[PDB]
Amino acid sequence: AGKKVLIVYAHQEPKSFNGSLKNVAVDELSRQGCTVTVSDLYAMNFEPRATDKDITGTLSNPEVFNYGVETHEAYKQRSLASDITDEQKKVREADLVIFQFPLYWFSVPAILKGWMDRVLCQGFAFDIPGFYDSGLLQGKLALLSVTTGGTAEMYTKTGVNGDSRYFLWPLQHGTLHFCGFKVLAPQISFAPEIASEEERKGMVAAWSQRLQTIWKEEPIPCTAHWHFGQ
Amino acid sequence: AGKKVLIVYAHQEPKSFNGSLKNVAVDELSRQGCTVTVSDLYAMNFEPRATDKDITGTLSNPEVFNYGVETHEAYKQRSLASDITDEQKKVREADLVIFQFPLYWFSVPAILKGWMDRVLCQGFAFDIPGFYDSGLLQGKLALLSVTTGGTAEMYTKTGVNGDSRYFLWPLQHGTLHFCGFKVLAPQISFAPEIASEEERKGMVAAWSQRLQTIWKEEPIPCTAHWHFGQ
Numbered sequence: 001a002g003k004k005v006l007i008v009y010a011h012q013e014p015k016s017f018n019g020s021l022k023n024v025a026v027d028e029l030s031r032q033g034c035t036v037t038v039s040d041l042y043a044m045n046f047e048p049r050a051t052d053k054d055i056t057g058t059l060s061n062p063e064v065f066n067y068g069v070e071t072h073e074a075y076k077q078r079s080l081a082s083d084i085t086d087e088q089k090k091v092r093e094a095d096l097v098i099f100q101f102p103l104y105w106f107s108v109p110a111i112l113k114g115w116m117d118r119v120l121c122q123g124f125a126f127d128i129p130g131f132y133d134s135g136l137l138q139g140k141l142a143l144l145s146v147t148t149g150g151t152a153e154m155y156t157k158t159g160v161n162g163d164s165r166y167f168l169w170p171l172q173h174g175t176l177h178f179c180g181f182k183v184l185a186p187q188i189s190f191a192p193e194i195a196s197e198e199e200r201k202g203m204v205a206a207w208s209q210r211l212q213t214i215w216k217e218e219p220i221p222c223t224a225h226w227h228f229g230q
Numbered sequence: 231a232g233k234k235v236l237i238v239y240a241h242q243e244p245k246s247f248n249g250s251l252k253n254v255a256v257d258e259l260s261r262q263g264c265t266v267t268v269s270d271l272y273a274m275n276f277e278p279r280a281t282d283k284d285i286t287g288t289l290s291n292p293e294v295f296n297y298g299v300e301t302h303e304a305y306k307q308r309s310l311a312s313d314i315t316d317e318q319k320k321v322r323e324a325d326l327v328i329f330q331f332p333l334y335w336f337s338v339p340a341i342l343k344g345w346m347d348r349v350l351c352q353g354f355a356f357d358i359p360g361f362y363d364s365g366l367l368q369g370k371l372a373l374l375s376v377t378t379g380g381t382a383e384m385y386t387k388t389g390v391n392g393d394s395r396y397f398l399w400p401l402q403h404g405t406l407h408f409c410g411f412k413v414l415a416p417q418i419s420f421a422p423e424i425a426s427e428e429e430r431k432g433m434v435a436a437w438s439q440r441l442q443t444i445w446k447e448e449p450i451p452c453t454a455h456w457h458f459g460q
């Protein structure tokens with residue numbers, strides 16, 4: 001019936017190819033009757049830095065600042081900064097989290113890295129126990145929709161950049177799998193800037209068309225073998 | 231004789247293990263007579279977000295903002311924000327760039343990711359063509375000094391996190407190699423929080439010790455095979 005979707009979106013420009021991918025996702029999921037929420041990081045001027053400002057009140061140890069320990073305690077004592085808890089609420093309510101971003105240095109743009117660093121704290125996303133298959137967000141789906149400057153050719157095992165699955169590893173496995181997400185196959189839109197309209201539209205349509213049956217999909221086996229083998 | 235080093239340092243707490251590893255680097259490189267500079271990113275409140283504030287001149291396309299295009303042109307024109315060019319000057323003068331950071335989500339902390347996103351712009355760090363072995367920072371060395379929460383065993387091929395080299399790919403190859411750096415072998419200090427006081431002191435001294443002969447080192451072959459195996 002009614003699945004809830006959070007789109008975490010990281011692009012500066014509404015007219016961008018990333019913006020269109022985000023908008024057709026909102027459009028198509030909305031059409032299906034899904035509950036949809038968008039975190040527009042640049043528009044929110046989202047704070048990427050992990051600092052002691054992320055804890056309100058009294059630090060667990062104001063002499064030596066340990067971010068990980070202090071945020072773990074602030075979570076369990078409900079004293080995290082509100083920009084963080086706002087995002088955790090959106091994530092708690094979502095059944096599927098889509099990340100929409102241009103590839104920046106084989107990874108996410110820093111503003112989105114900061115979202116991962118600050119929002120996915122211990123207590124909330126992971127714990128002992130509860131990581132990988134049993135991470136605290138199990139039951140949820142996650143999907144990386146990434147756009148690139150480099151063509152698909154460049155992202156082959158014999159290409160200069162190596163297989164795109166190589167750079168996926170820290171995101172899909174080290175971050176998403178670690179928190180208990182089932183990981184849906186990445187959506188990779190290769191090299192929009194150098195493409196035609198026929199190809200570009202094609203890529204947007206693939207995405208829109210894929211979203212039509214997203215709820216029927218099987219997760220990938222988020223394994224070293226999936227990423228590095230064959 | 232006259233080597234110049236830049237340490238790009240990303241930890242909030244001077245008394246931290248990262249702080250100590252950064253201080254022993256400065257101590258030992260300074261002892262050797264090297265020229266040493268540190269960018270203490272949190273202390274500088276370094277801006278991680280790639281935004282249109284990074285360009286102060288007339289935009290090449292004011293209607294649709296394209297960060298990579300606008301910063302490339304701004305670099306040529308000299309209309310980049312001055313925090314960016316301050317860093318570029320440090321890099322340009324360095325013979326060796328050391329990155330000192332705790333592993334955050336199989337990667338660098340967002341404030342450091344932002345340094346990479348914003349500082350290594352087209353025209354300065356790379357060109358098209360002019361990347362990988364043709365990168366503009368060719369002739370320079372780079373080295374990742376990483377600390378982890380995870381133990382070394384967790385970071386092996388058969389361990390839960392996979393081999394440590396797997397997560398190095400986006401950083402060593404996708405970023406440093408792409409810009410033309412030769413990459414020295416990573417320094418990874420595993421699980422200092424778990425370690426005994428003696429093991430901690432030893433890990434610090436192992437780093438100091440290595441630094442005594444850093445200038446005699448050859449780089450790694452920064453290739454898929456090195457990172458992933460056969």
Ligand SMILES: Cc1cc2nc3c(=O)[nH]c(=O)nc-3n(C[C@H](O)[C@H](O)[C@H](O)COP(=O)(O)OP(=O)(O)OC[C@H]3O[C@@H](n4cnc5c(N)ncnc54)[C@H](O)[C@@H]3O)c2cc1C
Nearest residue numbers: 016017018020102103104105106147148149150192200298
């Ligand atoms: C700091 C930095 C680091 C980077 N690192 C990497 C890297 O490691 N690897 C890599 O491969 N690339 C890298 N890039 C390149 C970057 O990933 C690409 O520039 C980015 O993915 C392009 O996506 P976009 O949404 O910004 O494209 P846009 O320029 O915004 O859009 C492409 C074109 O599509 C058009 N368009 C918009 N909407 C539609 C629509 N609905 N239908 C048809 N056309 C439409 C736009 O008008 C535009 O002309 C990096 C770039 C930067 C700035």
Ligand SMILES: Cc1cc2nc3c(=O)[nH]c(=O)nc-3n(C[C@H](O)[C@H](O)[C@H](O)COP(=O)(O)OP(=O)(O)OC[C@H]3O[C@@H](n4cnc5c(N)ncnc54)[C@H](O)[C@@H]3O)c2cc1C
Nearest residue numbers: 068246247248250332333334335336377378379380430431
């Ligand atoms: C957002 C986030 C994401 C993370 N993601 C990952 C991840 O993906 N993978 C992973 O493995 N880990 C991860 N971690 C854990 C993180 O990498 C470790 O907490 C970090 O590497 C520890 O380094 P530190 O400098 O902060 O240790 P500290 O806590 O500062 O140091 C540990 C101990 O060393 C002591 N010490 C300091 N100086 C000396 C000295 N000179 N001699 C002896 N002892 C000394 C300190 O006092 C302290 O007791 C993450 C943490 C956070 C907050």
Ligand SMILES: Brc1c(Br)c(Br)c2[nH]cnc2c1Br
Nearest residue numbers: 105106149150161404405408
């Ligand atoms: Br493959 C690659 C590409 Br194609 C681009 Br445009 C880029 N811009 C900044 N870093 C990069 C990389 Br690593």
Ligand SMILES: Brc1c(Br)c(Br)c2[nH]cnc2c1Br
Nearest residue numbers: 174175178335336379380391
């Ligand atoms: Br060991 C470890 C790992 Br392996 C990850 Br992926 C992580 N994310 C936040 N903290 C951590 C730790 Br402490």
Ligand SMILES: [Zn+2]
Nearest residue numbers: 173177222223
């Ligand atoms: Zn996995």
Ligand SMILES: [Zn+2]
Nearest residue numbers: 403407452453
């Ligand atoms: Zn390489």
